Amino acid sequence: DITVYNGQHKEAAQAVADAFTRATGIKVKLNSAKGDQLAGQIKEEGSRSPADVFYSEQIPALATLSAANLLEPLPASTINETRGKGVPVAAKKDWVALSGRSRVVVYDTRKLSEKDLEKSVLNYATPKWKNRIGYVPTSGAFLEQIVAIVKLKGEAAALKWLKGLKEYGKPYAKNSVALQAVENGEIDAALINNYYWHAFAREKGVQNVHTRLNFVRHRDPGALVTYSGAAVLKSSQNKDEAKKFVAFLAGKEGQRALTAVRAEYPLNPHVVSTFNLEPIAKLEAPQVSATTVSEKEHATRLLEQAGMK
Ligand SMILES: [Cu+2]
Numbered sequence: 407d408i409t410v411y412n413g414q415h416k417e418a419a420q421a422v423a424d425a426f427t428r429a430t431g432i433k434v435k436l437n438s439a440k441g442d443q444l445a446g447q448i449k450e451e452g453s454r455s456p457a458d459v460f461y462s463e464q465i466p467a468l469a470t471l472s473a474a475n476l477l478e479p480l481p482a483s484t485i486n487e488t489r490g491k492g493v494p495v496a497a498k499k500d501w502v503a504l505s506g507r508s509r510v511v512v513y514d515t516r517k518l519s520e521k522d523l524e525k526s527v528l529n530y531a532t533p534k535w536k537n538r539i540g541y542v543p544t545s546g547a548f549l550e551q552i553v554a555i556v557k558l559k560g561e562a563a564a565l566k567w568l569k570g571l572k573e574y575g576k577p578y579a580k581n582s583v584a585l586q587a588v589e590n591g592e593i594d595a596a597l598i599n600n601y602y603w604h605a606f607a608r609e610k611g612v613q614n615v616h617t618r619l620n621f622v623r624h625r626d627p628g629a630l631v632t633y634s635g636a637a638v639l640k641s642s643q644n645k646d647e648a649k650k651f652v653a654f655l656a657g658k659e660g661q662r663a664l665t666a667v668r669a670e671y672p673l674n675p676h677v678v679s680t681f682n683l684e685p686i687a688k689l690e691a692p693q694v695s696a697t698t699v700s701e702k703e704h705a706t707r708l709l710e711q712a713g714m715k
């Protein structure tokens with residue numbers, strides 16, 4: 407019936423495809439890769455691509471496929487489903503945002519409480535946090551964070567943050583490696599994404615975990631939410647059933663099914679997650695424009711300037 411190109415978590419995607427099929431009876435086959443490569447691969451088959459729907463963890467990928475006249479404009483009702491202040495809107499109305507995932511601080515509740523954390527993510531790059539703040543200089547989510555500080559605060563502020571993390575902080579190879587470092591009692595705190603912790607708590611049993619999360623809010627760069635979205639390709643030979651799916655994904659049903667398996671924040675406001683997430687608006691994420699190639703470029707330079715790459 408339909409084929410979706412999936413740059414999102416397979417378990418997530420499958421949950422949503424299964425929920426869709428059950429509800430309409432329409433079959434869904436998934437092509438799972440990193441969004442970047444699926445946007446790329448779509449471009450090259452132009453309008454003979456087998457993709458009906460592009461299910462992206464990355465809005466920038468939705469934007470390349472849009473600037474390239476490859477995406478089908480969606481009903482207002484669909485787009486309207488996840489509208490909220492702060493929510494990215496397609497200028498052309500040819501993709502829709504679905505959920506977000508946030509920057510957080512995980513901390514060791516055996517030695518730190520909320521009163522101990524900082525009001526700004528920028529404040530961690532200092533002697534006070536010497537040997538007490540971990541980071542993942544190699545992660546994409548870290549690179550997003552750098553992008554957002556340059557857009558919010560300018561270039562020197564970003565570079566200054568990174569040099570102070572480099573002198574004081576402690577690097578880890580993976581976000582999961584660092585999480586386990588706080589849980590293991592090796593450092594007080596670490597900058598990660600939220601879903602790693604929720605997944606871990608859900609598997610272990612929260613009474614058995616000694617870490618908790620801090621959200622900075624206050625429109626701080628550290629309150630950064632990264633959004634996922636979806637679009638239907640203008641080449642689809644299944645456009646009514648492809649549009650149906652995207653509507654599903656934006657709808658109540660689609661959204662509860664998502665947030666049954668994944669700790670992403672629903673953009674649909676009627677949806678309560680199975681995870682202990684506040685409403686996204688309460689995160690008070692900063693307004694930030696889409697990340698471009700140049701920006702990631704800019705940021706990677708900054709990383710190499712600070713001594714990280
Ligand atoms: Cu991730």
Ligand SMILES: [Cu+2]
Binds near residue numbers: 581
């Ligand atoms: Cu990751």
